[PDB]
Design a protein around this ligand. Sequence first.
Ligand SMILES: Nc1ncnc2c1ncn2[C@@H]1O[C@H](COP(=O)(O)OP(=O)(O)OP(=O)(O)O)[C@@H](O)[C@H]1O
Length: 49
Amino acid sequence: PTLSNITIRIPRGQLTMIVGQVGCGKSSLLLATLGEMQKVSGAVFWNSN
Ligand SMILES: Nc1ncnc2c1ncn2[C@@H]1O[C@H](COP(=O)(O)OP(=O)(O)OP(=O)(O)O)[C@@H](O)[C@H]1O
């Protein structure tokens, strides 16, 4: 695994400006959010209005 223990909840209309270092899981989360990263132990349920 290249990422774990991600516990963030964001309702709709929540502008969440992600900041971080040079290579500390910024774009990787941006891709894993869409579903392009293999998730091993994660409870994720995307839903909309
Ligand atoms: N799609 C991917 N598949 C495999 N490894 C990835 C993927 N995307 C990023 N990585 C790797 O995971 C690590 C985390 O990188 P990260 O996602 O933080 O990069 P970044 O935010 O684009 O970087 P930077 O701050 O330099 O712009 C790096 O070693 C990177 O090479």
